[PDB]
Amino acid sequence: DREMLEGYLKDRLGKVLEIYPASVKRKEDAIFFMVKNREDGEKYLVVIGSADVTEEFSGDYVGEIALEKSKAKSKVKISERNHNNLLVLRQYLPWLNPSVCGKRSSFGTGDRLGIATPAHVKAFEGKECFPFLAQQAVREMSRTGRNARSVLDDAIWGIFESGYEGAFGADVDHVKDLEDIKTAIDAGYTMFTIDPSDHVLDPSTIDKAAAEHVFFELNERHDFLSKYEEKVYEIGGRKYTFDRDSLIETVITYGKAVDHVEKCYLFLKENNRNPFELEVSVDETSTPTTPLAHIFIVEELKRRGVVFTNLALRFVGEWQKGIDYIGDLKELDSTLAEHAAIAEVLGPYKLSLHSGSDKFSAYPYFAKHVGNLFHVKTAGTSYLEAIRVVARFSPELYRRIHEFALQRFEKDRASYHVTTDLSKVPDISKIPDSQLEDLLNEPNTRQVIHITYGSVLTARNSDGSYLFRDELFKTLSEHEREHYEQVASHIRKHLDLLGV
Ligand SMILES: [Zn+2]
Ligand SMILES: [Zn+2]
């Protein structure tokens, strides 16, 4: 029984170590599982088996035990979740490795904290949907002190705690330059979201002379007019015609970005021996992606040999972080029908919705038009659920965090376009500890907390110690069950409304 192993461990190491039953796996002669120290919340891997297997793991030996199956004694060793031990574990447990998704529906669950992957796994139970359990943008990793190795390692450690053996993917989100691509390659990420948004031009903000010079140079090098001028596409009972000026606007908007994407794809082809997937994100545009722009981007990618699986368009309406969709559902439905039809005939390929966190108003139309071949990305919503749990069990922490975030909001709201109304966040000094949790139901407070995640995590006192991160993680460890169920139920709501 589990309690006998726990007593063995308590007697020899002198700590109360509780076993996660679902983590226990038996392969080779060996038995692997994860324990948690009741005193400090530290989690450890325990390996029981032949000396030849325990020797490949670093850590201190606990002793010898007798397996029920065989007379010969087995070595018991306890190891920390360092990187090389996770590598050895991932060789003994081959499912602990990211896979390429392919042309099937998927869902990304970013984890800005590194501890929510078991909950994300709970959310996919029974769902027919490929999970991206490792997903963090380069900028998120920068703002949190994590790197691609550590993000993937956190996700895989959580998967091991959960006991999940199905497939999963690892997405390096919004990548711009080639060195970050190299780090994600060396870590073994399986999806690369190429973000060429630096090169995207908005013709409504630049002068006409500059737009002209840009088109002239791009067309002198690529001959876009001979390729596309007057060309007609029949897709979905509709006609699309590349007239001169539409093609010119499209080229000035997207040509240099397509060049950037080509360069990144060629880099991945040269430096990645492992199976990989490529998503092309144009989710950073002030204007919704027109259908003609969609056609041009996809046709240029196909002409250049850039093999992509996902295309993340910028849809009509308002896609702000932490709140629901604001837009004309009529036009969203119609444009989604348009883009889905073009995706079918051009590829087919996956349409990828970034900023999907909490857009429940729009998920019906999404499941209608792309419900077969979609990808939906989320990240900050799990952080919001964690902060909700913090306000539920450590209100004095949430109060200080709320004030600090309100003061940091001005510097932090620059990198995002949020129409937050600060006068509509409730006055926290008039709210007792017993009710702070309700604050995370109010959209503008949700935006303030979503946006300032990095500042709260990185905040440091004068002496050099962090103000919140230590207590934040200790709080979340003390109420792991509640954190898990809140995150899992939220993500599963997202999956339910998407029809999977
Ligand atoms: Zn570039
Ligand atoms: Zn995004």
Short mmCIF file of C-alpha atoms and ligand atoms in Angstrom, two decimals:
data_model
loop_
_atom_site.label_atom_id
_atom_site.label_comp_id
_atom_site.label_asym_id
_atom_site.label_seq_id
_atom_site.Cartn_x
_atom_site.Cartn_y
_atom_site.Cartn_z
CA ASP A 1 0.00 0.00 0.00
CA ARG A 2 0.96 3.63 -0.54
CA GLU A 3 1.16 4.24 3.21
CA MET A 4 3.81 1.53 3.59
CA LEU A 5 6.10 3.19 1.04
CA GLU A 6 5.42 6.54 2.71
CA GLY A 7 6.36 5.02 6.07
CA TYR A 8 9.56 3.55 4.60
CA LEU A 9 10.53 6.98 3.28
CA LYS A 10 9.58 8.74 6.52
CA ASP A 11 11.65 6.27 8.55
CA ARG A 12 14.76 6.64 6.43
CA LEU A 13 14.91 10.28 5.27
CA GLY A 14 13.01 11.68 8.26
CA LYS A 15 10.47 13.76 6.32
CA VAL A 16 6.74 13.44 5.64
CA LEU A 17 6.70 12.65 1.90
CA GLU A 18 3.27 12.10 0.35
CA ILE A 19 3.00 10.16 -2.92
CA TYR A 20 0.97 11.31 -5.91
CA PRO A 21 -0.74 8.01 -6.81
CA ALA A 22 -1.38 9.01 -10.43
CA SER A 23 2.34 9.70 -10.98
CA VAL A 24 3.41 6.10 -10.26
CA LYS A 25 4.72 4.35 -13.38
CA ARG A 26 6.30 0.91 -13.71
CA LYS A 27 8.61 0.38 -16.68
CA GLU A 28 11.69 -1.86 -17.04
CA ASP A 29 11.94 -3.26 -13.51
CA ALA A 30 11.88 0.35 -12.32
CA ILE A 31 9.09 2.24 -10.55
CA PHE A 32 9.05 6.04 -10.81
CA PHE A 33 6.85 8.42 -8.85
CA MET A 34 6.76 11.89 -7.31
CA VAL A 35 6.51 12.81 -3.63
CA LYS A 36 5.76 16.10 -1.88
CA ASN A 37 7.26 17.18 1.44
CA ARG A 38 4.43 18.14 3.80
CA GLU A 39 6.68 20.72 5.49
CA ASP A 40 8.06 22.90 2.67
CA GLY A 41 6.13 21.81 -0.43
CA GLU A 42 9.23 20.61 -2.29
CA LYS A 43 8.52 17.87 -4.83
CA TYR A 44 10.95 15.07 -5.64
CA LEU A 45 11.26 12.10 -7.98
CA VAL A 46 11.65 8.67 -6.38
CA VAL A 47 13.17 5.85 -8.45
CA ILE A 48 13.00 2.25 -7.24
CA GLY A 49 14.72 -0.48 -9.22
CA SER A 50 17.91 -2.20 -10.26
CA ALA A 51 21.24 -0.53 -9.53
CA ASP A 52 21.86 -0.11 -13.27
CA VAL A 53 18.81 2.19 -13.48
CA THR A 54 19.20 4.14 -10.23
CA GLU A 55 22.84 4.86 -11.12
CA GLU A 56 21.76 6.97 -14.11
CA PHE A 57 19.90 9.31 -11.71
CA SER A 58 21.60 11.89 -9.52
CA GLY A 59 20.48 12.16 -5.90
CA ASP A 60 20.99 10.35 -2.63
CA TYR A 61 20.07 6.71 -2.03
CA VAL A 62 17.40 5.89 0.55
CA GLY A 63 18.16 2.19 0.91
CA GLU A 64 16.91 -1.14 -0.38
CA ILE A 65 13.34 -2.49 -0.43
CA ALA A 66 11.99 -5.90 -1.47
CA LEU A 67 9.65 -5.85 -4.48
CA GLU A 68 6.56 -8.08 -4.09
CA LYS A 69 7.21 -9.46 -7.62
CA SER A 70 10.81 -10.67 -7.01
CA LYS A 71 12.96 -11.90 -4.07
CA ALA A 72 15.93 -9.66 -5.03
CA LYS A 73 16.04 -6.26 -3.22
CA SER A 74 15.61 -3.02 -5.25
CA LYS A 75 17.48 0.28 -4.72
CA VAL A 76 15.44 3.32 -3.68
CA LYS A 77 16.81 6.74 -4.63
CA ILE A 78 15.33 10.23 -4.27
CA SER A 79 16.25 12.88 -6.85
CA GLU A 80 15.55 16.54 -7.42
CA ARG A 81 13.91 17.74 -10.63
CA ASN A 82 17.08 19.14 -12.16
CA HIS A 83 17.40 19.19 -15.94
CA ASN A 84 19.56 16.09 -16.46
CA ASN A 85 17.40 14.00 -14.13
CA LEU A 86 14.37 15.06 -16.17
CA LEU A 87 16.25 14.01 -19.32
CA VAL A 88 16.96 10.55 -17.88
CA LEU A 89 13.32 10.29 -16.76
CA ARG A 90 12.13 11.30 -20.24
CA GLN A 91 14.23 8.50 -21.70
CA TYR A 92 12.74 5.94 -19.30
CA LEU A 93 9.22 7.37 -19.82
CA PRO A 94 9.08 8.10 -23.57
CA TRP A 95 5.67 9.80 -23.48
CA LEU A 96 7.28 12.67 -21.52
CA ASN A 97 8.29 14.34 -24.79
CA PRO A 98 6.55 16.95 -26.96
CA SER A 99 5.11 15.88 -30.30
CA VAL A 100 4.19 17.69 -33.49
CA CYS A 101 0.46 18.40 -33.54
CA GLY A 102 -0.36 18.08 -37.23
CA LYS A 103 -3.63 18.96 -38.90
CA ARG A 104 -5.85 18.39 -35.88
CA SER A 105 -7.52 20.75 -33.43
CA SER A 106 -5.35 21.98 -30.56
CA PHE A 107 -5.43 24.32 -27.57
CA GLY A 108 -2.57 26.12 -25.84
CA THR A 109 -2.45 26.61 -22.07
CA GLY A 110 0.35 29.01 -21.18
CA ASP A 111 1.66 28.89 -17.61
CA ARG A 112 3.37 32.09 -16.44
CA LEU A 113 4.02 30.50 -13.02
CA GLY A 114 5.30 27.00 -13.86
CA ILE A 115 3.00 25.07 -11.50
CA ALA A 116 -0.37 24.83 -13.31
CA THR A 117 0.35 22.08 -15.86
CA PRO A 118 -1.38 19.33 -13.77
CA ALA A 119 -4.54 21.46 -13.79
CA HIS A 120 -4.26 22.03 -17.55
CA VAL A 121 -3.94 18.24 -17.92
CA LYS A 122 -7.09 17.79 -15.82
CA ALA A 123 -8.87 20.17 -18.20
CA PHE A 124 -8.25 18.01 -21.29
CA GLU A 125 -9.57 14.80 -19.68
CA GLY A 126 -12.02 13.34 -22.20
CA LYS A 127 -11.58 16.21 -24.66
CA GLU A 128 -10.62 15.36 -28.24
CA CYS A 129 -8.15 18.22 -28.57
CA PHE A 130 -4.36 18.29 -28.86
CA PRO A 131 -2.92 20.10 -25.81
CA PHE A 132 -0.04 22.59 -25.91
CA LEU A 133 1.00 22.36 -22.27
CA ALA A 134 4.31 24.20 -22.80
CA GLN A 135 3.62 27.63 -24.28
CA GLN A 136 5.28 30.91 -23.30
CA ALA A 137 6.20 33.92 -25.40
CA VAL A 138 9.81 35.11 -25.56
CA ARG A 139 8.71 38.31 -23.81
CA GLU A 140 6.92 36.41 -21.02
CA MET A 141 10.04 34.31 -20.36
CA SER A 142 12.07 37.53 -20.34
CA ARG A 143 9.70 39.17 -17.85
CA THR A 144 9.64 36.14 -15.51
CA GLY A 145 13.32 35.12 -15.42
CA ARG A 146 12.51 31.80 -17.10
CA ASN A 147 13.89 30.39 -20.35
CA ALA A 148 12.66 27.84 -22.88
CA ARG A 149 14.45 25.01 -21.07
CA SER A 150 12.85 25.91 -17.74
CA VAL A 151 9.37 26.45 -19.21
CA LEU A 152 9.42 23.06 -20.93
CA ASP A 153 10.91 21.44 -17.82
CA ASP A 154 8.17 22.89 -15.60
CA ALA A 155 5.50 21.62 -18.00
CA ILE A 156 7.04 18.13 -18.20
CA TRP A 157 7.43 17.95 -14.41
CA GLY A 158 3.74 18.79 -14.08
CA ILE A 159 2.83 16.17 -16.68
CA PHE A 160 4.81 13.63 -14.66
CA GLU A 161 2.94 14.63 -11.50
CA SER A 162 -0.35 14.14 -13.36
CA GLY A 163 0.52 10.71 -14.78
CA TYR A 164 -0.68 11.73 -18.25
CA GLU A 165 0.69 9.58 -21.08
CA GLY A 166 -0.99 11.13 -24.13
CA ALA A 167 0.62 13.41 -26.68
CA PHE A 168 1.35 17.09 -26.14
CA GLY A 169 3.13 19.94 -27.87
CA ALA A 170 5.52 22.73 -26.86
CA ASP A 171 5.06 26.11 -28.53
CA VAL A 172 7.59 28.94 -28.42
CA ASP A 173 5.24 31.88 -28.80
CA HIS A 174 5.75 35.10 -30.81
CA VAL A 175 9.35 34.46 -31.82
CA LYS A 176 11.10 37.21 -33.78
CA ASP A 177 14.86 36.60 -34.01
CA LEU A 178 16.94 33.56 -34.81
CA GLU A 179 18.80 33.14 -31.51
CA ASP A 180 15.56 32.57 -29.61
CA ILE A 181 14.67 30.05 -32.32
CA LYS A 182 18.03 28.39 -31.60
CA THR A 183 17.33 28.17 -27.87
CA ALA A 184 13.90 26.66 -28.53
CA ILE A 185 15.53 24.20 -30.95
CA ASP A 186 18.12 23.10 -28.39
CA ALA A 187 15.34 22.66 -25.82
CA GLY A 188 13.34 20.56 -28.30
CA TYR A 189 10.26 22.71 -28.85
CA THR A 190 7.93 21.29 -31.49
CA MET A 191 6.02 24.40 -32.63
CA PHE A 192 7.51 27.76 -33.61
CA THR A 193 5.19 30.78 -33.79
CA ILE A 194 6.95 33.19 -36.15
CA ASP A 195 6.01 36.82 -35.45
CA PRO A 196 7.06 39.13 -38.31
CA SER A 197 5.03 42.02 -36.88
CA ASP A 198 8.06 44.33 -36.64
CA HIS A 199 8.08 44.48 -40.46
CA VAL A 200 4.32 44.96 -40.88
CA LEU A 201 3.47 48.44 -42.16
CA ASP A 202 0.14 50.18 -41.61
CA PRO A 203 -0.43 52.30 -44.75
CA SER A 204 -2.91 54.53 -42.89
CA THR A 205 -0.07 55.87 -40.71
CA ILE A 206 2.75 56.31 -43.24
CA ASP A 207 2.98 58.89 -46.01
CA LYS A 208 2.19 57.99 -49.62
CA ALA A 209 5.76 58.63 -50.81
CA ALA A 210 7.17 56.08 -48.35
CA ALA A 211 4.47 53.54 -49.25
CA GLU A 212 5.35 54.02 -52.92
CA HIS A 213 9.08 53.53 -52.42
CA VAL A 214 8.38 50.41 -50.35
CA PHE A 215 6.16 48.85 -53.01
CA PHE A 216 8.61 49.81 -55.76
CA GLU A 217 11.55 48.07 -54.09
CA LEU A 218 9.58 44.98 -53.04
CA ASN A 219 8.10 44.57 -56.53
CA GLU A 220 11.45 45.19 -58.22
CA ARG A 221 12.83 42.26 -56.25
CA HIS A 222 9.84 39.86 -56.33
CA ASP A 223 7.73 40.87 -59.38
CA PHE A 224 4.43 40.74 -57.51
CA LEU A 225 2.44 42.44 -60.28
CA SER A 226 3.12 39.78 -62.92
CA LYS A 227 2.31 37.09 -60.36
CA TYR A 228 -0.92 38.43 -58.89
CA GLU A 229 -2.34 41.47 -60.73
CA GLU A 230 -5.88 40.76 -62.05
CA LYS A 231 -5.79 37.18 -60.69
CA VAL A 232 -9.22 35.95 -59.56
CA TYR A 233 -10.01 33.45 -56.79
CA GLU A 234 -13.38 31.70 -56.48
CA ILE A 235 -13.72 30.61 -52.83
CA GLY A 236 -16.99 30.03 -50.99
CA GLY A 237 -19.50 31.36 -53.49
CA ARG A 238 -17.45 34.54 -53.77
CA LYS A 239 -14.94 36.25 -56.04
CA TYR A 240 -11.66 37.83 -54.95
CA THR A 241 -9.75 40.00 -57.43
CA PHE A 242 -6.23 41.39 -57.02
CA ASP A 243 -6.74 44.79 -58.60
CA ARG A 244 -3.64 46.99 -58.81
CA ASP A 245 -4.14 49.12 -55.68
CA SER A 246 -5.45 46.30 -53.49
CA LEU A 247 -2.35 44.26 -54.39
CA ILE A 248 -0.13 47.29 -53.77
CA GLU A 249 -1.60 47.91 -50.31
CA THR A 250 -1.29 44.19 -49.51
CA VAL A 251 2.35 44.13 -50.63
CA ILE A 252 3.35 47.22 -48.66
CA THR A 253 1.61 45.75 -45.61
CA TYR A 254 3.01 42.21 -45.72
CA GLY A 255 5.91 41.65 -48.15
CA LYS A 256 8.83 42.33 -45.82
CA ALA A 257 7.05 40.32 -43.12
CA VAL A 258 6.79 37.37 -45.52
CA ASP A 259 10.52 37.80 -46.16
CA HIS A 260 11.14 37.62 -42.40
CA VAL A 261 9.04 34.45 -42.13
CA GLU A 262 10.96 32.86 -45.01
CA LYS A 263 14.28 33.64 -43.32
CA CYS A 264 13.12 32.09 -40.03
CA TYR A 265 11.79 28.97 -41.77
CA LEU A 266 15.08 28.47 -43.62
CA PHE A 267 16.95 28.86 -40.33
CA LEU A 268 14.77 26.16 -38.76
CA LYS A 269 15.33 23.90 -41.78
CA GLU A 270 19.09 24.30 -41.43
CA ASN A 271 19.47 23.97 -37.65
CA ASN A 272 16.65 21.64 -36.49
CA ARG A 273 17.08 17.89 -36.95
CA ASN A 274 13.92 17.21 -34.97
CA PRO A 275 10.29 17.27 -36.16
CA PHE A 276 8.92 20.80 -35.93
CA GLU A 277 5.79 22.78 -36.72
CA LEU A 278 5.47 26.39 -37.86
CA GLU A 279 2.75 28.93 -37.07
CA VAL A 280 2.66 32.26 -38.92
CA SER A 281 1.11 34.94 -36.70
CA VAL A 282 -0.24 38.22 -38.08
CA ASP A 283 -2.20 38.78 -34.88
CA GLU A 284 -0.43 42.14 -34.35
CA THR A 285 -2.14 44.46 -36.84
CA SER A 286 -4.28 47.53 -36.19
CA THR A 287 -6.64 46.45 -39.04
CA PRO A 288 -8.39 43.08 -39.36
CA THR A 289 -6.69 40.83 -41.89
CA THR A 290 -8.60 41.30 -45.14
CA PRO A 291 -9.42 38.20 -47.20
CA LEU A 292 -7.16 39.36 -50.03
CA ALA A 293 -4.31 39.78 -47.54
CA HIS A 294 -4.99 36.24 -46.31
CA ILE A 295 -4.78 34.90 -49.87
CA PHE A 296 -1.60 36.86 -50.61
CA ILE A 297 0.19 35.71 -47.45
CA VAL A 298 -0.71 32.05 -47.94
CA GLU A 299 0.14 32.04 -51.65
CA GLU A 300 3.49 33.72 -50.99
CA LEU A 301 4.31 31.19 -48.27
CA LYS A 302 3.42 28.33 -50.63
CA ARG A 303 5.41 29.81 -53.52
CA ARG A 304 8.53 30.16 -51.35
CA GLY A 305 8.24 26.65 -49.90
CA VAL A 306 7.54 27.83 -46.35
CA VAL A 307 5.66 24.85 -44.89
CA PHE A 308 3.34 26.07 -42.13
CA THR A 309 0.62 24.36 -40.09
CA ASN A 310 -1.06 27.31 -38.34
CA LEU A 311 -1.98 30.81 -39.54
CA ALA A 312 -3.00 33.31 -36.85
CA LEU A 313 -5.04 36.10 -38.42
CA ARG A 314 -6.20 39.35 -36.85
CA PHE A 315 -9.99 39.20 -36.73
CA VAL A 316 -12.60 41.95 -36.59
CA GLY A 317 -13.46 43.40 -33.20
CA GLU A 318 -11.73 43.86 -29.87
CA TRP A 319 -9.38 41.18 -28.55
CA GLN A 320 -8.08 42.62 -25.28
CA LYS A 321 -6.50 40.43 -22.62
CA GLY A 322 -8.58 39.09 -19.75
CA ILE A 323 -12.06 40.12 -20.95
CA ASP A 324 -14.58 38.88 -23.50
CA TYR A 325 -15.01 39.78 -27.16
CA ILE A 326 -16.34 43.24 -28.06
CA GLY A 327 -17.47 43.50 -31.67
CA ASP A 328 -20.28 43.01 -34.16
CA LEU A 329 -21.03 39.28 -33.97
CA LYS A 330 -22.63 39.53 -37.42
CA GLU A 331 -19.42 40.72 -39.09
CA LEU A 332 -17.29 38.32 -37.04
CA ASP A 333 -19.43 35.38 -38.19
CA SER A 334 -19.28 36.51 -41.82
CA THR A 335 -15.52 37.19 -41.90
CA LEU A 336 -14.89 33.90 -40.09
CA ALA A 337 -16.85 32.06 -42.78
CA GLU A 338 -14.71 33.89 -45.35
CA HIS A 339 -11.37 33.02 -43.74
CA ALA A 340 -12.38 29.40 -43.06
CA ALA A 341 -13.37 28.91 -46.70
CA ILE A 342 -10.09 30.39 -47.94
CA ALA A 343 -8.15 28.20 -45.50
CA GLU A 344 -9.91 25.05 -46.74
CA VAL A 345 -9.20 25.64 -50.48
CA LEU A 346 -5.71 27.21 -50.05
CA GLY A 347 -4.43 24.42 -47.72
CA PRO A 348 -6.07 23.14 -45.70
CA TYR A 349 -4.37 24.58 -42.57
CA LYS A 350 -5.23 25.53 -38.99
CA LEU A 351 -6.66 28.93 -38.16
CA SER A 352 -5.13 30.13 -34.89
CA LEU A 353 -6.91 32.47 -32.45
CA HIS A 354 -4.51 34.35 -30.24
CA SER A 355 -5.94 36.23 -27.21
CA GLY A 356 -8.59 33.48 -26.85
CA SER A 357 -8.63 33.78 -23.03
CA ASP A 358 -12.24 34.51 -22.04
CA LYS A 359 -13.70 35.30 -25.51
CA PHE A 360 -16.73 33.13 -24.70
CA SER A 361 -19.06 35.41 -26.67
CA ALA A 362 -17.19 34.51 -29.88
CA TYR A 363 -16.53 30.80 -29.34
CA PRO A 364 -19.91 29.69 -30.83
CA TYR A 365 -19.09 31.21 -34.23
CA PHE A 366 -15.54 29.83 -34.02
CA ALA A 367 -16.79 26.30 -33.35
CA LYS A 368 -19.24 26.84 -36.22
CA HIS A 369 -16.77 27.88 -38.91
CA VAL A 370 -13.42 26.32 -37.91
CA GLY A 371 -14.57 23.80 -35.28
CA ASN A 372 -12.71 21.06 -37.17
CA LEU A 373 -9.28 22.71 -37.69
CA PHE A 374 -8.58 25.35 -35.04
CA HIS A 375 -5.94 26.37 -32.56
CA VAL A 376 -6.70 28.62 -29.57
CA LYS A 377 -4.01 30.22 -27.41
CA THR A 378 -4.31 31.28 -23.76
CA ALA A 379 -1.86 32.15 -20.98
CA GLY A 380 -2.73 34.99 -18.61
CA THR A 381 -6.11 33.51 -17.68
CA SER A 382 -4.43 30.80 -15.60
CA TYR A 383 -2.47 33.54 -13.83
CA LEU A 384 -5.77 35.29 -13.13
CA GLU A 385 -7.20 32.11 -11.61
CA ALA A 386 -4.11 31.77 -9.42
CA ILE A 387 -4.47 35.37 -8.22
CA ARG A 388 -8.14 34.61 -7.52
CA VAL A 389 -7.08 31.73 -5.27
CA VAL A 390 -4.58 34.08 -3.59
CA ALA A 391 -7.38 36.55 -2.84
CA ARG A 392 -9.49 33.64 -1.59
CA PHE A 393 -6.93 32.37 0.94
CA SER A 394 -4.35 35.17 1.49
CA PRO A 395 -6.32 38.44 1.29
CA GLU A 396 -3.51 40.51 2.84
CA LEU A 397 -1.24 39.41 0.00
CA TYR A 398 -3.88 40.21 -2.62
CA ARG A 399 -4.47 43.67 -1.14
CA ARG A 400 -0.81 44.70 -1.40
CA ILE A 401 -0.61 43.10 -4.86
CA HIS A 402 -3.68 45.03 -6.03
CA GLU A 403 -2.26 48.38 -4.90
CA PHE A 404 1.19 47.67 -6.36
CA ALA A 405 -0.33 46.62 -9.69
CA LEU A 406 -2.55 49.70 -9.78
CA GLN A 407 0.55 51.87 -9.44
CA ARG A 408 2.53 49.89 -12.05
CA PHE A 409 -0.35 49.80 -14.56
CA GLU A 410 0.74 52.95 -16.43
CA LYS A 411 4.22 51.68 -17.32
CA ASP A 412 2.89 48.18 -17.93
CA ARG A 413 -0.04 49.11 -20.23
CA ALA A 414 2.29 50.37 -22.98
CA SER A 415 3.11 47.03 -24.64
CA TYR A 416 -0.61 46.19 -24.89
CA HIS A 417 -3.56 48.13 -26.33
CA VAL A 418 -6.12 47.97 -23.52
CA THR A 419 -9.04 50.40 -23.15
CA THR A 420 -9.11 49.93 -19.37
CA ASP A 421 -11.23 52.37 -17.35
CA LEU A 422 -9.38 52.86 -14.06
CA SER A 423 -12.33 54.69 -12.48
CA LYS A 424 -14.36 51.45 -12.68
CA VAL A 425 -12.05 49.23 -10.63
CA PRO A 426 -13.51 49.14 -7.10
CA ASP A 427 -11.85 50.97 -4.23
CA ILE A 428 -9.92 48.28 -2.37
CA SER A 429 -9.68 50.20 0.93
CA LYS A 430 -13.50 49.98 1.15
CA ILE A 431 -13.50 46.18 0.66
CA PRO A 432 -12.93 43.73 3.54
CA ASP A 433 -10.68 40.69 3.33
CA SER A 434 -13.72 38.40 3.07
CA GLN A 435 -14.72 39.81 -0.34
CA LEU A 436 -11.52 40.67 -2.26
CA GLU A 437 -12.02 37.64 -4.53
CA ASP A 438 -14.98 39.31 -6.24
CA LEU A 439 -12.50 41.85 -7.63
CA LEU A 440 -11.21 39.25 -10.10
CA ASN A 441 -14.69 39.13 -11.67
CA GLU A 442 -14.51 42.80 -12.70
CA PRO A 443 -13.09 43.18 -16.25
CA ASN A 444 -10.90 46.25 -15.66
CA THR A 445 -9.34 44.76 -12.53
CA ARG A 446 -8.78 41.61 -14.59
CA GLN A 447 -6.87 43.70 -17.14
CA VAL A 448 -4.80 45.51 -14.50
CA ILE A 449 -3.76 42.20 -12.93
CA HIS A 450 -3.29 40.34 -16.24
CA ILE A 451 -1.04 43.10 -17.54
CA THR A 452 1.23 43.58 -14.50
CA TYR A 453 2.03 39.86 -13.93
CA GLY A 454 5.76 40.35 -14.57
CA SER A 455 6.03 43.37 -12.27
CA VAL A 456 4.37 41.49 -9.35
CA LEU A 457 6.63 38.43 -9.95
CA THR A 458 9.82 40.54 -10.37
CA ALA A 459 9.05 43.13 -7.67
CA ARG A 460 11.89 43.40 -5.12
CA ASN A 461 12.21 45.28 -1.81
CA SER A 462 15.03 47.68 -0.98
CA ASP A 463 17.04 44.99 0.82
CA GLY A 464 16.97 42.92 -2.40
CA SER A 465 14.29 40.40 -1.43
CA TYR A 466 11.18 40.01 -3.56
CA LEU A 467 7.99 41.51 -2.19
CA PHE A 468 5.50 38.96 -3.50
CA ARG A 469 6.99 36.05 -5.46
CA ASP A 470 8.12 33.99 -2.44
CA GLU A 471 4.84 34.36 -0.55
CA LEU A 472 2.86 34.02 -3.79
CA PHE A 473 4.36 30.62 -4.58
CA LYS A 474 4.14 29.45 -0.95
CA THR A 475 0.46 30.44 -0.87
CA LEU A 476 -0.21 28.60 -4.13
CA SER A 477 1.60 25.52 -2.81
CA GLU A 478 -0.45 25.53 0.41
CA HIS A 479 -3.75 25.48 -1.54
CA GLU A 480 -2.72 23.31 -4.48
CA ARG A 481 -6.05 21.47 -4.71
CA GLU A 482 -8.11 24.67 -5.04
CA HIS A 483 -5.65 26.23 -7.51
CA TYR A 484 -5.80 23.05 -9.59
CA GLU A 485 -9.59 22.83 -9.70
CA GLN A 486 -10.11 26.52 -10.52
CA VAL A 487 -7.59 26.48 -13.38
CA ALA A 488 -8.87 23.13 -14.68
CA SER A 489 -12.53 24.17 -14.65
CA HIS A 490 -11.76 27.47 -16.38
CA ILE A 491 -9.75 25.83 -19.18
CA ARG A 492 -12.43 23.14 -19.53
CA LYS A 493 -15.08 25.85 -19.92
CA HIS A 494 -12.95 27.20 -22.77
CA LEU A 495 -12.78 23.72 -24.31
CA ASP A 496 -16.51 23.07 -23.86
CA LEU A 497 -17.65 26.22 -25.65
CA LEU A 498 -15.28 25.37 -28.53
CA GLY A 499 -17.15 22.10 -29.12
CA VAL A 500 -14.40 19.62 -28.27
ZN ZN B 1 13.61 40.61 -40.45
ZN ZN B 2 -0.62 36.16 -28.76
#
